[PDB]
Structures are given as structure tokens and as C-alpha cells.
Amino acid sequence: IPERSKLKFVERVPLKDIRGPSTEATDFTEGNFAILALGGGYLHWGHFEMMRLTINRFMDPKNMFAIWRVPAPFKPITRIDHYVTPVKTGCLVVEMGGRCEFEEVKGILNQVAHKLPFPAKAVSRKTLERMHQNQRERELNNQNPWTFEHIATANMFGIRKFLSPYDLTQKGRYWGKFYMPKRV
Amino acid sequence: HWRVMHFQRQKLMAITEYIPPKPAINPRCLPPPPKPPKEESGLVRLLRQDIVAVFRDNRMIAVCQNVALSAEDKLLLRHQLRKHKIFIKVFPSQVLKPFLENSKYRNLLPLFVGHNLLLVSEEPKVKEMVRVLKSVPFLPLLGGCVDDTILSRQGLVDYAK
Amino acid sequence: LREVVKITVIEGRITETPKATPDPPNPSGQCPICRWNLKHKYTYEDVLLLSQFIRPYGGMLPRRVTGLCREEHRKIEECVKMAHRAGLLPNHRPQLPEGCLPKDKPKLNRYLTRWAPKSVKPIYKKGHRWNKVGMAVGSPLLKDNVCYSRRPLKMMH
């Protein structure tokens, strides 16, 4: 159990940032239970306090601990009113761990996730692994001969007249700041 | 907020939707898969030994219905029986049945009925056992075996004399 | 089937019940429906099949006694409601107390009724072409039934 089990404080003062698949904080580091971002959104300091206060009160110092998986607010906002921390879909906002089962932390993590600015979910190591396995399984066993990548990459049907350059990389999974899970 | 997508782009998404494979027969309706091999918990192994041990040690095994009396109140009756050096045994009969299936006692399965207490001792104080039964009026006796002889209550009472 | 008769002295007498027709077409079928290859081939109109799982007063029998799987229990239960609401089970009416009589109103003919008629609100604002509010027909539980039409059945009318 880390000595500083409780969440630390966050300093108030130190378009594509949330428009694609995440490349950071996508893997569990120390904890087993964490909140997974399912969309792109900006986390201002107010959200940070809600996560800090709610999680700290419930967690047991003897058996539980938590850590932050995202940087403090650094991006300027003007009417320099305040700074917002960008987050990409797939990021782990906060990580929890300890000699506890997922079910114990499900309620608090899910409650915290609901109040986040973007859609989010509470996932353990197993659940995150299961989600990826299901995604790969769906792609392999898909019975639709046509897929977004092949049509877009090969410019079949003259499709690229109606597509953005970024669409080829995303392959239709991501539209704007929203992530479509079922879309293979 | 949602931003509308050109029709042609929407048409592309409509045609590229994932299609899952469908099975000919649902797995449920099909004959059940062979049972995964079960394991015997150490308690059961010890429990099995306990039932074997009590039968080996105790010559007489009688069957008296259970009443789920309060533990302390049960101890009161147990204390009276302990004063008479007669012991009470309770077991998860689910493990008892295998033995009765293949053992010296095979006709006592009907006597054993769910919540039925067991009587065990080293001496056939059957008359005192009936007397100890008279302590609790409602407490009935179903039967069992005394001195390795299987008999019912009416025979036990006649055997008591 | 055991029936309780009173006289006070009350006794239950067991009577012999007809047994299942021998030699199911598809042995090794866990649930009764699947044994006869009826998984996706029964609808509310099939009273002969449905009546077998119905109490004398129109109630559904418990799942344990029938042995049906959960998926088919739900399907069988839903069709019976639709069969009852469609007036296909005239002899399985409720056991109204001797001090009660039918509502005495004329009865509107129905079929494929998803919901209880008493608790459905009227659609005052129906909506325009790509805004229409739809009137549900049939039950979604039966979407997986075999379809003999060019395209899937129109659930929303």
C-alpha cells in the first residue's frame, strides 16, 4: 500500500487534442480498477475536485490506494479564464488498486464517471482485456465482405470526394469527438 | 452536438455495418457439454472420514428427527445426553448417502430424512434413550439400528424391554 | 394430477394423466419445444401448442413443470397474452367470483396485441413523414421466427 494512498491536489493554475484514439494512459500501471474514457472531452479543475473528494472519502487507507493518470490543466481558454486538461477516448482518467475486488469499487467509480464531462466507464484489468478481445473477435468473424477501410483506401465508388483525409486513418470508428464501439 | 453527415457518407456507414456469424443450432438446445470434472473439497474428504469414523466407533446408530432447536437450548439437551454419555451427530447427509448405498447398512436410507438428528454411543442404553426422548414430548424417533440390528421405533420400544 | 376434495375432512386424490406422445422427432432436445423442432415456427395463432402450457383459467404454468428454456418460456408466455387478447381461448376465461359478471360491453376484435389494451395512451400528435409516431404490432420476442416475405415483417405500423 503506497503511503500517499489518497489522491493528491491539482493546481488550478500551472481541436485534434480530443478528436482521435488515445495513445497515452491506455494501460493499467499499478492499480487493477480504473475509469475508462469512452469519449473526447475537456476536464476542468471542477471535475478534478469531484474525483478527488469523492474517491478520497470512500477509500480505506489500510486496504486501498489511488493515483492520477492524467496531467494537470495546462491548455489556455479565453472568453485566460481557466485551463482544461484534454482527454482522448480510451484514456484512463484515474487508477485505483489494493486488496479489494472490483465490485467494491464499482459503485464509486461508476458514480464518479457519470459526472465526468465526457462518457466514461469503470473497468478493471479483466474488463479492459475483455473489451479488446471482443473488438478483435468482431473484426475477425465479421460476415460483411465490405469494410470501411477497403472502400476508403481503394477510393471505390468515388467515396473520397465525401471523406476527410483523416477518415482513412480512423477507419470510421471515430466521428468527430465521438467513438463508436460497435462500428468495426 | 451531432453534425449531419452527407447522404453518400451515411450510405457508406449503412453498408459497412458489422454482421455477426449465426449458428445453425443454438448451443443451449443442443445436448449439454460433458460435465467439467468436479473436485472434492478437503472438508468433504474429512467429512467422509468423519461419517466412516462414527460408524466404525459406534455400534448402535439410531435416527431421531431434527427440530433445529436453539444452540444453547440444544446444548441443554446435549448436556443431559452427555451426562448419559450419549452423543449427538449431525452431517450433510448428501455425503452420507454414498456410504449407505454401499455399506453394511443399506435399508436405512428411508429412515434418514433431511433434517434428522443422529444418535451414537458405545452402550445400548435404549431404554434411557427413550427416556431422554420423553424429556421433549414432541421430539419423535424414526428408527435406525441398535447393536448392528436395524429396527423401527415400535421394535426399538419392544427391544428396550 | 392430484385434486383436493373437501367434506370437515379434506383429501387429495391422484388421478392418471395422459402421457406425452412417444418417439419425439428430434430426441436429445433439452427443452420440449426444441425436441419437436418448433424453435422458430409457432405464433400466437397456434392455440393447440399454447393451450398445453395453460392453466384451466388461462394462467401460464410454471417454468419448472413445463421444462421450457427461459427463451421459449418468455416467447410462450407472450403469445398466450396475445392469444387471450385476440379471443382465441374462449374456454380459459378468468374465475370471476359468483358475485361478479363480465364487463358486459361489446368486444372489439383484436390480433397481434403487444400491450394490455387498458393502459395504452392515444397518439394525439402523430407526426409528419420522417417524424411519424409508430403503432406497435406484434411482439419483439418473435423477431427470430421464420419469415416467408421478401423483407422482414413490419413491426411498427
Binding site: F157 | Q10, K11 | -
Partner: peptide
Amino acid sequence: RTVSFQAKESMIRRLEVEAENHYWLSM
């Protein structure tokens, strides 16, 4: 707003014809 059945079928036909065009252009 859903996409009609006419609309999705006709595109797949065009895709199949274009799929063959890929093959005949490879030799």
C-alpha cells in the same frame, strides 16, 4: 434518418462491378 433498402443494395452492386475492375487491371 435511416438509409433505404434500395440505396444499400444498389451501391453493393456498384462495388462488386468495381471490385472486378480491380482484378482485370492487375494483369
